[PDB]
């Protein structure tokens, strides 16, 4: 931080930790002759190991926030607040974060009281806050791709060939029941206007690549049937996943519909004069706000703010436990600024369960907000400017009533 700057508040939008596959469909089973390995928990649940890996991040956050003078060297209950999505995986990630940040302090997490409905903070379109127009979705995704979607597979030939090899797709029951080239067999298509999906090879491979990454992060004895040997290969496979998220979650039209409530909540917590839905029982003296969500949430916020990144040592742009960390800093004369970093465990740190300390830290990338005309060279954006960007980026129809 520049000369005289002081950290005042932190807002962490974190993905949940290492989880089992959220689904295992007949198609997923049929695209390989290999057997998918069994997980120790129900579909979509965070594992005990994933909780531990989140706690290690909590421990890192504690050391960092102590160092920067924000936290004491148990915090007061007012100083730390957790809002988790209703899923087991997010709830337990919020708990695991507190177990690392403030061990055995019994700090509360919060979440929506009806866990049988979507939380509109995280899924406003699904919750029925607002809707999208089918023709505008189609147009926006095509523009984001810069190529017709029908030929998207051509752009990812190398990656799709590598997926095919890892799966042994030509030998699979799918190829037995239907040339059997992964890319040609499953052309990319957009399925749409409150439900939007990328169908075909890239969509499917995106899911599978993420599952392989989760297997590795879980320290499973056999990952992708032993077929992923190098970091290059991990990058090539996760490229498919990152691409699907660029199109389905970063595309500004979609990003603004699904991301508006979160961005308002984040902005308000940083000190913007943006309406946001108050979080129940939060203190005006709050110092750390931890929001436990999903990769789509991070990607939405990325899209809205025009923020892009690559993470050294981490093939997934939105890995389990990876978090956008927004910070309000003030200069010596009390002017507020916002910084944003994408803070994460490398693939190796996930696999090894590495302790994360000041000496051996989490990965961290400082993000540029391109529209922040008066940002400093080290990426500090005046709050006044940040607030204007937020005002321009939100979809008013999607603000939380
Ligand atoms: K294991």
Numbering used by the authors: 4 to 76, 79 to 183, 188 to 201, 205 to 413
What text comes from the article?
Phytases (myo-inositol hexakisphosphate phosphohydrolases) catalyse the hydrolysis of phytate into inorganic phosphate (Pi) and lower phosphorylated myo-inositols. Here we report the identification of two HAPPs from the enterobacteria Hafnia alvei (HaPhy) and Yersinia kristensenii (YkPhy), together with biochemical studies of their pH and temperature optima, as well as their phytate degradation pattern, which show that they are 6-phytases. The enzymes share a common catalytic site architecture located at the interface of the two domains involving the conserved N-terminal active site motif RHGXRXP and the C-terminal HD. The two-step reaction involves a nucleophilic attack on the phosphorous by the histidine from the RHGXRXP motif to form a covalent phosphohistidine intermediate while the aspartic acid of the HD motif serves as a proton donor to the oxygen atom of the scissile phosphomonoester bond.
The MIHS-HaPhy complex is the first structure of a 6-phytase showing a phytate analogue with the 6-position in the catalytic site. Co-crystals with the wild-type HaPhy grew in clusters of insufficient quality for data collection, but a successful hit was obtained for the 5% active T308A mutant of the enzyme. While the mutant MIHS-HaPhy complex crystallised in a different space group to the apo-enzyme and tar-HaPhy complex, the overall fold is essentially unchanged, with one molecule in the asymmetric unit and residues 184–189 disordered. The OD1 atom of Asp307, the proton donor, forms an H-bond with the oxygen at position 6 of the inositol ring, Fig. 5b,c,d. Thr308 has been mutated to alanine in the MIHS-HaPhy complex, so a potential H-bond to the 1-sulphate is missing: Thr305, the equivalent residue in EcPhy, coordinates the axial 2-phosphate. There is a second MIHS bound between three symmetry-related phytase molecules in the crystal, in a completely different conformation, with the 2-sulphate in the equatorial orientation and all five others axial.
